[PDB]
């Protein structure tokens, strides 16, 4: 009952400017599953003895959707609930893996945001080099078939990179995109169990539908084919092992 809440938050190290660093790892936290109040509460008492001193926080975005968003109502009370000084100590968080789900929310949530909107203190890190399956790490390490100059559809065109791994897909962004007030680089991460469908509209064209995300994504690339086709790959290879 407890446990399962201090994989989401804890401390670990000292920053290269000697203050103590903390991590929030947003895939761990299932908005339903997890209690808002005990997650808070174990935040509070982690932070309690440093938190009248400069720290810094490390947020862990790397396959963050909607199943771990706050809730509005819930997002709210982060923002009254610890003392003052807590949050003006706070000298640095570094944005880690953040991705299209993330830019749309914190758009939709822009107006309580505002305070983080082209802060000084948040630093987005645009390059990852600075019984449980972990799934995200091993998306992040398996070999790779990279489609480069790749183009994602949608208000504005984004030129983006389109990796296909044995159990996930990667699309970064080649340009950079606006969050929070700063130009960023996005990677968003779906594993062959969040492809619902998959169609190839032309030789270089084709939609993805994201299990749990209402507007399929559409890119186009000269190699479509080849991409669709290995995509479908993967979708398989994952069914196929999911028990009869
Ligand atoms: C520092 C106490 C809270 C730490 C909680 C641990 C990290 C949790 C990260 C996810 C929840 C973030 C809730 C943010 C609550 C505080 C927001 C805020 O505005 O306080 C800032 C204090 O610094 C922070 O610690 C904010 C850290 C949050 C970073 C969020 C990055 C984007 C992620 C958003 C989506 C998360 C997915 C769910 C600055 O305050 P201000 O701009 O109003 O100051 C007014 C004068 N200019
Ligand atoms: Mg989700």
Sequence with gaps: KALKTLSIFYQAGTSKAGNPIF???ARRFKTGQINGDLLIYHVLLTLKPYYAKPYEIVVDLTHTGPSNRFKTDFLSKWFVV???????????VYIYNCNSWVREYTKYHERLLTG???????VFIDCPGKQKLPAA?????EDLKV?????????????VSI???????????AE???????????????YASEIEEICLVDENQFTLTIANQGTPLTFMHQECEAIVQSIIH????????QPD
């Design 23 to 25: 991590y929030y790892v």
């Design 82 to 92: 610890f003392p003052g000084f807590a949050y003006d100590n706070v000298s640095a």
């Design 116 to 122: 983080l909107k082209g802060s000084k203190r948040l």
């Design 137 to 141: 790490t091993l998306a992040l390490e």
């Design 147 to 159: 489609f480069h100059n790749a183009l994602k559809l949608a208000h504005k065109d984004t030129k």
């Design 163 to 173: 990796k296909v791994g044995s159990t996930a897909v990667q699309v970064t962004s």
């Design 176 to 190: 950079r995109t606006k969050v929070l007030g700063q130009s960023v680089f996005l990677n968003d991460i779906y």
């Design 234 to 241: 993967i979708r398989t290879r994952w069914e196929l092992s």
